[PDB]
Design a protein around this ligand. Sequence first.
Ligand SMILES: CCCCCCO[C@@H]1O[C@H](CO)[C@H](O)C[C@H]1O[C@@H]1O[C@@H](C)[C@@H](O)[C@@H](O)[C@@H]1O
Ligand SMILES: [Hg+2]
Ligand SMILES: [Hg+2]
Ligand SMILES: [Hg+2]
Ligand SMILES: [Hg+2]
Length: 264
Amino acid sequence: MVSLPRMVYPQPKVLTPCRKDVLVVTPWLAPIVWEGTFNIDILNEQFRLQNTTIGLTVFAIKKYVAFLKLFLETAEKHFMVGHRVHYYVFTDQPAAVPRVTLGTGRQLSVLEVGCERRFLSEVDYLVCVDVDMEFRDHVGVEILTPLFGTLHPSFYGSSREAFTYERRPQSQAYIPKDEGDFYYMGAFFGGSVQEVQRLTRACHQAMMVDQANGIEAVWHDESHLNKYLLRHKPTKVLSPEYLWDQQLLGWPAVLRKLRFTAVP
Ligand SMILES: CCCCCCO[C@@H]1O[C@H](CO)[C@H](O)C[C@H]1O[C@@H]1O[C@@H](C)[C@@H](O)[C@@H](O)[C@@H]1O
Ligand SMILES: [Hg+2]
Ligand SMILES: [Hg+2]
Ligand SMILES: [Hg+2]
Ligand SMILES: [Hg+2]
């Protein structure tokens, strides 16, 4: 909206590819976010000028409440630093949530589980992740867009036939062998509040239909997420830098940074 201020940075090079080892744009022209493709200073300016507020939702039930301290502490160091952040921790153990010190402009709300209209008035974007993870490097506004999915670390180099999509036609999450762009992991997705609510409503309804027909998608929520993103292309796709498991997969040359990883 408002004009950007004067900024001094390296001129983009039209005749020099960002990466010669990976795909940086999808066939529907959505950027695939890898280190080396973006200038965070320009993006920070764009989103700060709009006073962007990002909501980060996480579910911590039962023994998973134990992962909250590390999750929140590292998010404080690497997640959307400089921007307004609102953490939403859904848990069955409110008193078990650790008291983590937050930077200015950042807040945390504990919601006990046993209205979505709130999200629409409190944040601009919603980022939904799993709690048994830790941030190890920058995860910022470069990911914000109407709707985004993240490439699963175990399948980014696999052919669609190898993807573990739901293959039974009796399921609403069904995807045949000749269809599919990527295999997105259910542990990291998001977008505008509106698009995220549309996705969750669609998946919830599809799961109810499957339940009524006596069938459960092979990878549950993740299977439905993949079916949804197949039919509603994400406006940005995050590379595996954003969802990794170093103990299981190491640190391949294709990853210049490991930003958000599984906790052993
Ligand atoms: C030692 C076990 C290897 C699992 C590799 C494949 O990852 C799994 O993929 C399915 C869908 O096919 C689903 O997404 C769960 C996922 O496993 C989780 O994520 C991987 C990356 C590891 O961190 C596992 O420990 C997780 O359980
Ligand atoms: Hg570049
Ligand atoms: Hg969410
Ligand atoms: Hg769905
Ligand atoms: Hg979903």
